[PDB]
Design an enzyme around this catalytic site. Structure first.
Site, short mmCIF file in Angstrom:
data_model
loop_
_atom_site.label_atom_id
_atom_site.label_comp_id
_atom_site.label_asym_id
_atom_site.label_seq_id
_atom_site.Cartn_x
_atom_site.Cartn_y
_atom_site.Cartn_z
N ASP C 128 0.75 -1.28 -0.07
CA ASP C 128 0.10 0.11 0.10
C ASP C 128 0.82 1.03 -0.18
O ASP C 128 0.66 2.14 0.93
CB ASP C 128 -0.89 -0.08 1.21
CG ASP C 128 -2.05 1.06 1.17
OD1 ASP C 128 -2.21 1.36 -0.38
OD2 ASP C 128 -2.99 1.53 1.94
N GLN C 132 -0.17 9.24 0.99
CA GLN C 132 -0.64 9.34 2.39
C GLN C 132 -0.06 8.75 3.03
O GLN C 132 0.15 8.80 4.28
CB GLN C 132 -2.20 9.15 2.30
CG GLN C 132 -3.13 9.98 1.36
CD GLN C 132 -2.92 9.80 -0.21
OE1 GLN C 132 -1.80 10.43 -0.53
NE2 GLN C 132 -3.92 9.19 -0.79
#
EC number: 2.7.11.22
Lengths: 10, 258, 297
Positions: C128, C132
């Protein structure tokens, strides 16, 4: 389909 | 993913040593025995087929148990709880779909409660200081397979079978590191089905010769010989199915030529 | 316990509880505290956590975020992290008109790949990577972070969790429905992130599985059995897909000189077996001249 079981004195 | 074969293998070889449990650990545990351990692992094997988990989870779980019973004296009533709780842990670590906790209560046949499992979960976690990412006899075999000329599910299967057999026998196999046990197995499994042997590119990669393996290799062979006559068969039945190419019925060599 | 931490603001909320700026009352150290809610009778400690910790615990590297302590308090878990200024998606939003100095790009990505190559060589997939999730500091370091979805892989690889990587950074082998994947997926993502650093706007921004494939396709070209043996046999592959063709990268990525382009595309390879890796990347000619300039915050 049968493996549940209590192995010892608890 | 050859980009990091060696880099991983090396890392792993170094992690076992860290996550290695204490040899005669059972000798200080005042109320349990290498014998009852097996009844314990033997069961988990059985739990693993019912719930359709991965071999990894077995090896993981066994090792959390070994490590944990290397520090906490546990009583008879509780060995099963420790072992259920670790199964759960190896689950959560390694399966895409971990069994749930009530399912894990169920296989102990309502011995312990939900709370209890979950409460141990933690202890195991705390005692293991969250270091659950262990190398396994599985990990290495998996890698060693890659040097297979050419690949052969039987050999692969037998390799496993054997390897797994050692989970059950606290003495000696607690003596050996997984990379060796996996060495001990893969060869054994080769010679048997193809009469070949520890391929030389694994002498090079792992630096373990026939000789260095011997002492694992001898034990592993006995354990193989006497497998139809051992007190716990759950593994043996397991490697009877087509899944694993019927390997447990293969008949082992009768002399290792070592 | 937390008797010794004071919460400061709430920086970020995720997954299983919140995430707080916190200072350690004895030492002053400013930390990030991710609380993880447990509860007996529920699944216990959730497994993002179990994986999040065990894996993070073994990943020690300048460019991987540092776990300090995990505080087990019976009823909750708190992960103590070093604090980092901000994630890479703010920094980028904050330079939408300025831009990012090439040597900061060049550097951030060096770093990134350094973190990832340690990850991979230590058999952890991040699964991932996105802005962010990459944190930077005042002093121009950058570290892989949020290991929520990380997992320990094997060699060779097994089938894992297919529900994976944020749509925008999801490599195609995952998109086209694969049964196996690996490290390559970590490198699709940097790949993208790279470009995102260059243009200050998302490379392939899709809003469902199909779009995200299409956008990919309209850039690197509909793929075939020559650039990626196996494609037309991957489960979610359709013969109907359109056969767009490749744009020249000098469209895709206009500021990138000759050597970035090169890496960008070796990163953005279709065939995973062929798509470049870390330690490989690091040694690429892009990076012969690297340094550590300090970000304008």
């Amino acid at each position: 389909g049968s493996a549940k079981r209590r192995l010892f004195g608890e | 993913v050859p980009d990091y074969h060696e880099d991983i293998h090396t890392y792993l070889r170094e992690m076992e040593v860290k996550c290695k449990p204490k040899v005669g650990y059972m000798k200080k545990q005042p109320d349990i025995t290498n014998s009852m351990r097996a009844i314990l692992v033997d069961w988990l094997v059985e739990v693993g087929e019912e719930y359709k988990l991965q071999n990894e989870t077995l090896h993981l779980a066994v090792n959390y148990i070994d490590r944990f019973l290397s520090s906490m004296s546990v009583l008879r009533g509780k060995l099963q709880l420790v072992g259920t709780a670790a199964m759960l842990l190896a689950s959560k670590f390694e399966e895409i779909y971990p069994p749930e906790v009530a399912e894990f209560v169920y296989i102990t046949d309502d011995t312990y409660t939900k709370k209890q499992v979950l409460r141990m979960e933690h202890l195991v976690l705390k005692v293991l200081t969250f270091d659950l990412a262990a190398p396994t006899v599985n990990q290495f075999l998996t890698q060693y397979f890659l040097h297979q000329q050419p690949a052969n599910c039987k050999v692969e299967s037998l390799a496993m079978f054997l390897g797994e057999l050692s989970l059950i026998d606290a003495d000696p196999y607690l003596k050996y590191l997984p990379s060796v046990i996996a060495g001990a197995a893969f060869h054994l499994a080769l010679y048997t089905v193809t009469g070949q042997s520890w391929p030389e590119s694994l002498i090079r990669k792992t630096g373990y010769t026939l000789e260095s393996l011997k002492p694992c290799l001898m034990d592993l062979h006995q354990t193989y010989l006497k497998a139809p006559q051992h007190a716990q068969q759950s593994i043996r039945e397991k490697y009877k199915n087509s899944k694993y190419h019927g390997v447990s019925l293969l008949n082992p060599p009768e002399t290792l030529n070592l | 316990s937390m008797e010794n931490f004071q919460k400061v603001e709430k920086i970020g909320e995720g997954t299983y509880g919140v995430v707080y700026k916190a200072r350690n009352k004895l030492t002053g150290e400013v930390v990030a505290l991710k609380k993880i809610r447990l509860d007996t009778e529920t699944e216990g400690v959730p497994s993002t956590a179990i994986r999040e910790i065990s894996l993070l615990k073994e990943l020690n590297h300048p460019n991987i975020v540092k776990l300090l302590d995990v505080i087990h308090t019976e009823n909750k878990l708190y992960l103590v992290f070093e604090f980092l200024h901000q994630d890479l998606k703010k920094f980028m939003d904050a330079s939408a008109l300025t831009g990012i100095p090439l040597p900061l790009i060049k550097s951030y990505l060096f770093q990134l790949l350094q973190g990832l190559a340690f990850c991979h060589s230590h058999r952890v997939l991040h699964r991932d990577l996105k802005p962010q999730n990459l944190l930077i500091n005042t002093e121009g370091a950058i570290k892989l972070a949020d290991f929520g979805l990380a997992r320990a892989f094997g060699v060779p690889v097994r089938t894992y969790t297919h529900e994976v990587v944020t749509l925008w950074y999801r490599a195609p082998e995952i998109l086209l429905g694969c049964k196996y994947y690996s490290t390559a997926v970590d490198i699709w993502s940097l790949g993208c992130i790279f470009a995102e650093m260059v243009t200050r706007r998302a490379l392939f921004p899709g809003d469902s599985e199909i779009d995200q494939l299409f956008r990919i396709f309209r850039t690197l070209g509909t793929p075939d059995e020559v650039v990626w043996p196996g494609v037309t046999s991957m489960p979610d592959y359709k013969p109907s897909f359109p056969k767009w063709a490749r744009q020249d990268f000098s469209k895709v990525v206009p500021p990138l000189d000759e050597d970035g382009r090169s890496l960008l595309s070796q990163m953005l390879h279709y065939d995973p077996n062929k798509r470049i890796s870390a330690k490989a990347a690091l040694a690429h000619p892009f990076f012969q001249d690297v340094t550590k300039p300090v970000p304008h915050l």
